[PDB]
Design an enzyme around this catalytic site. Structure first.
Site, PDB file in Angstrom:
ATOM      1  N   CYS B 179       0.792  -1.233   0.000  1.00  0.00           N
ATOM      2  CA  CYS B 179       0.000   0.000   0.000  1.00  0.00           C
ATOM      3  C   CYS B 179       0.831   1.293   0.000  1.00  0.00           C
ATOM      4  O   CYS B 179       0.276   2.393   0.032  1.00  0.00           O
ATOM      5  CB  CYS B 179      -1.015  -0.026   1.142  1.00  0.00           C
ATOM      6  SG  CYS B 179      -2.190  -1.401   0.978  1.00  0.00           S
ATOM      7  N   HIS B 320      -2.110   8.494   6.187  1.00  0.00           N
ATOM      8  CA  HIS B 320      -2.397   7.228   5.527  1.00  0.00           C
ATOM      9  C   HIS B 320      -3.721   6.642   6.017  1.00  0.00           C
ATOM     10  O   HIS B 320      -4.427   5.975   5.254  1.00  0.00           O
ATOM     11  CB  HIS B 320      -1.245   6.241   5.728  1.00  0.00           C
ATOM     12  CG  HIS B 320      -1.466   4.912   5.076  1.00  0.00           C
ATOM     13  ND1 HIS B 320      -1.540   4.754   3.708  1.00  0.00           N
ATOM     14  CD2 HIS B 320      -1.625   3.677   5.607  1.00  0.00           C
ATOM     15  CE1 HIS B 320      -1.739   3.479   3.426  1.00  0.00           C
ATOM     16  NE2 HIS B 320      -1.794   2.803   4.560  1.00  0.00           N
ATOM     17  N   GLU B 331      -0.823   5.987  13.751  1.00  0.00           N
ATOM     18  CA  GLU B 331      -0.391   7.130  12.956  1.00  0.00           C
ATOM     19  C   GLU B 331      -0.689   8.453  13.662  1.00  0.00           C
ATOM     20  O   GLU B 331       0.101   9.393  13.575  1.00  0.00           O
ATOM     21  CB  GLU B 331      -1.024   7.108  11.565  1.00  0.00           C
ATOM     22  CG  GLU B 331      -0.476   8.193  10.653  1.00  0.00           C
ATOM     23  CD  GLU B 331      -1.066   8.164   9.263  1.00  0.00           C
ATOM     24  OE1 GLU B 331      -2.139   7.553   9.068  1.00  0.00           O
ATOM     25  OE2 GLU B 331      -0.451   8.766   8.363  1.00  0.00           O
ATOM     26  N   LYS B 354      -9.210   8.880   2.653  1.00  0.00           N
ATOM     27  CA  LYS B 354      -9.677   7.510   2.414  1.00  0.00           C
ATOM     28  C   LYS B 354     -11.146   7.266   2.790  1.00  0.00           C
ATOM     29  O   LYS B 354     -11.730   6.258   2.390  1.00  0.00           O
ATOM     30  CB  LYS B 354      -8.766   6.491   3.105  1.00  0.00           C
ATOM     31  CG  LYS B 354      -7.472   6.224   2.350  1.00  0.00           C
ATOM     32  CD  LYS B 354      -6.720   5.030   2.921  1.00  0.00           C
ATOM     33  CE  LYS B 354      -5.417   4.765   2.168  1.00  0.00           C
ATOM     34  NZ  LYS B 354      -4.377   5.795   2.447  1.00  0.00           N
ATOM     35  N   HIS B 359      -9.645   2.766   0.165  1.00  0.00           N
ATOM     36  CA  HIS B 359      -8.227   2.418   0.140  1.00  0.00           C
ATOM     37  C   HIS B 359      -7.839   1.943  -1.261  1.00  0.00           C
ATOM     38  O   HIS B 359      -8.180   0.824  -1.662  1.00  0.00           O
ATOM     39  CB  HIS B 359      -7.939   1.322   1.171  1.00  0.00           C
ATOM     40  CG  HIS B 359      -6.489   1.171   1.515  1.00  0.00           C
ATOM     41  ND1 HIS B 359      -5.473   1.654   0.717  1.00  0.00           N
ATOM     42  CD2 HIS B 359      -5.886   0.556   2.559  1.00  0.00           C
ATOM     43  CE1 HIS B 359      -4.307   1.366   1.268  1.00  0.00           C
ATOM     44  NE2 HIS B 359      -4.530   0.696   2.385  1.00  0.00           N
ATOM     45  N   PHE B 419       1.890  -3.425   4.034  1.00  0.00           N
ATOM     46  CA  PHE B 419       2.189  -4.713   4.663  1.00  0.00           C
ATOM     47  C   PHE B 419       3.685  -4.991   4.566  1.00  0.00           C
ATOM     48  O   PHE B 419       4.334  -4.617   3.584  1.00  0.00           O
ATOM     49  CB  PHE B 419       1.407  -5.840   3.975  1.00  0.00           C
ATOM     50  CG  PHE B 419      -0.051  -5.927   4.377  1.00  0.00           C
ATOM     51  CD1 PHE B 419      -0.820  -7.019   3.970  1.00  0.00           C
ATOM     52  CD2 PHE B 419      -0.654  -4.942   5.163  1.00  0.00           C
ATOM     53  CE1 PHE B 419      -2.171  -7.124   4.325  1.00  0.00           C
ATOM     54  CE2 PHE B 419      -2.002  -5.040   5.526  1.00  0.00           C
ATOM     55  CZ  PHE B 419      -2.761  -6.135   5.107  1.00  0.00           C
TER      56      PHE B 419
END
Ligand SMILES: [K+]
Ligand SMILES: [K+]
Lengths: 431, 431
Positions: B179, B320, B331, B354, B359, B419
């Site tokens: 991502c 993010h 975050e 988002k 996403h 990831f």
């Protein structure tokens, strides 16, 4: 800032470990064998489906990593001991562990750990895992789907697992550029050390794509060798008149790159300097290179220009040549264009090692960069296997190596080309 | 060498084109709708299997690119024009065309074409095509396997199609980092221009992974939103107390990066300068960030150091935050750690977009970089959607934006995490 190589690590069809791979390569050995039903990776399918599927494969040869608990073998019990670890991930971790121990780089201090990154890409990932999951859809058994499915198919995950194992908190990266994947991953990592993003990078390529759909897929692209199924050891023949496509291989190549002053400070042994990272695009065709090999010319020229070296100062070229009729000739033509008199006089030494290893795909560029570094380190240039009748482009002087030859190798260049017309050329030199 | 942005292009769930996407984003709109049977991409399966599979999916919400021949819509007849073009490739080409026509960069000269490269990554590629091919194994119909199977599934092929369309022969590249893919692809391209590998780079990310197995795989990992299936437009809620996982989206973001002097010499319109490219690894867990968000802190801190700017000089942060319980909070802590007094004064504007786009996975980092550039360009900071009850971490004036705030934006930072603990932070500034 200059970038040097302080550690080498690999797992190939010629064995697990640099020592075993290099020894067998120089001795002229070959890791190709005929396919069996087990090689399809179809344990979740019935025997009738296995048998049918095998029969649909035009290419029935491949180059396999030797598994086992003995020296020179890849132990799945040690490297594939987790549910989230696909084979390509295990190969990279195995190779990275060898490279890091070779480099004596296992830092405990957070400062050093934070300055160490990872850039190990895979080309395709784990098709066999996606096939198993897709079977659950067809058979209406989706309840069985693993929570680890997504993590084990992502092509960046080798970097993730390596960084996690050693606590490496520098750039966590992967370049994925098909069969140039291992080259770009190493090259990008070099750029990062140069710019100051990291002081140490664990970089390379990995691939474990020998399975039913991968073989069938590449066979449908008409990319694979088919007419040497009864004689596997003769199936991969770069630059030979009777070449008929590449032979899929598997494995990983990982190197430790680090900034020169950093390496000297800690008293690390240095194999070579990485002096050139040439990149280009063919802008021609999804799978086929252009007749003139302009892309390959650009990539080689750019690597040379960066190093400040003339064509005549290049001792050894490890060619991409995969054993394909068009591809090999195009690169040969491109080598003639870049090196001209240096090549046509027979002064330039060049070979493709894919006769021995097969096409390691995403790992090819990394493994072959290691071969190039080792050529410099040992003063031995590896042979091309199976050149019984050299391509018409070649003559008495302009000719690929057919025996392993002792020679001073102060500079070694390695070409890697991929689908999409993506080209990389890595240039190493003694330091 | 300094690197500036001279073109923007995008295809998102908020529309085809920058014009429509930005307008709808700023107007507080959302591209998320409920999943149907047609969305499974299971055209080769019977109705019974479609219904079974759909019933097995815990998440039944997704964010789709609007298709059609009208303004703001993606014309599939134009971009999905051959058998070799998977959706992620089509979106990338569409976005690249917009970006290049925006940059007014369609060179005819071989010199300029050779100095133009492409770095557009895909995160997963085309799972649905692998599923279809795997079905041929189950049904013993491998005869029907497409010759374009391999070229369609390769994550680097967007770069390949863009380069051959425009004849770009500079570095042909892709960073694939889950991502963070769109961010690393843009960042890598920046390094290449900085070093002198290219003068122009077409860079970004693309993804089209809304299909049976992708949704099933992410659902099984417990990564997706499930509680809001009856109210899709409410499903993505970054920073909100009732968030329960991300919503899969699709699309592409592509920007034209250019060397500063090169841009000025041709009189190009310049949006912003890319000033920082921070990279780190969590080295913690395959899918979960660490509680303290050290990786995120490192990535943000690194992008800041490179720019020569201090936290107080940052006007906007595009987080993010994907609408996941642990992720968003981590975050938030990381933002507070980096920006301290600038965050708690309320002067730092920050949001996750988002909630609106979903996403976009491999495209996320690129689309959100575009939003950060547009914030600078337009003087409007985008809102976070669906924050009915802010996470307890947020106190007093340390709060994400919940409305489109008109304000001078001199500097904008965008975070992208993937990831494997791979982190990227991109920092843009006016110039
Ligand atoms: K090579
Ligand atoms: K972001």
């Amino acid at each position: 800032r200059r970038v040097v190589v302080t550690g080498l690590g690999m797992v190939t069809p010629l064995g697990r470990g640099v020592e075993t791979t290099w020894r067998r390569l120089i001795d002229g050995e070959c890791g190709i064998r005929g396919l069996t039903l087990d090689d399809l990776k179809m344990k979740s399918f019935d025997e009738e489906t296995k048998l049918y599927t095998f029969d649909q494969l035009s290419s029935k040869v491949a180059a396999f990593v030797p598994y086992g608990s003995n020296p020179g073998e890849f132990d799945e019990a040690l490297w594939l001991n987790s549910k989230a670890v696909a084979n390509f991930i295990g190969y990279a971790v195995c190779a990275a562990d060898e490279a890091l121990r070779d480099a004596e780089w296992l830092p405990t201090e957070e400062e050093e750990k934070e300055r160490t990154g990872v850039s190990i890409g895979g080309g395709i990932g784990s098709i066999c895992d996606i096939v198993e999951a897709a079977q659950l859809i067809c058979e209406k058994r989706l309840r069985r789907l693993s929570p680890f499915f997504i993590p084990k198919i992502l092509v960046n995950m080798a970097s993730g697992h390596v960084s996690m194992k050693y606590g490496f908190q520098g750039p966590n990266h992967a370049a994925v550029t098909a069969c140039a994947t291992g080259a770009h991953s190493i090259g990008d990592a070099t750029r990062m050390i140069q710019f100051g993003d990291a002081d140490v990078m664990v970089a390379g390529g990995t691939e474990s794509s020998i399975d039913a759909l991968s073989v069938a897929g590449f066979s449908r692209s008409r990319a694979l060798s088919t007419k040497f199924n009864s004689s596997p050891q003769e199936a991969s023949r770069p630059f030979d008149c009777d070449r008929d496509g590449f032979v899929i291989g598997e494995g990983s190549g990982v190197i430790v790159l680090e900034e020169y002053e950093h390496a000297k400070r800690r008293g690390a042994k240095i194999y070579a300097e990485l002096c050139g990272y040439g990149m280009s695009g063919d802008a021609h065709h999804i799978t086929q290179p252009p007749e003139d090999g302009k892309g390959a010319v650009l990539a080689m020229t750019r690597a040379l220009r960066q190093s400040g070296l003339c064509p005549n100062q290049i001792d050894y070229v490890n060619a991409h040549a995969t054993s394909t009729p068009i591809g090999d000739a195009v690169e040969a033509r491109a080598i003639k264009t870049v090196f001209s008199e240096h090549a046509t006089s027979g002064t330039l030494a060049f070979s493709s090692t894919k006769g021995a290893t097969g096409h390691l795909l995403g790992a090819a560029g990394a493994v072959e960069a290691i071969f190039s570094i080792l050529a410099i380190h040992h003063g031995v240039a590896p042979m091309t296997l199976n050149v019984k009748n050299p391509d018409p482009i070649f003559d008495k002087r302009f000719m690929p190596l057919t025996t392993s030859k002792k020679m001073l190798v102060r500079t070694a260049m390695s070409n890697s080309f991929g689908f999409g017309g993506t080209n990389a050329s890595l240039l190493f030199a003694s330091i």
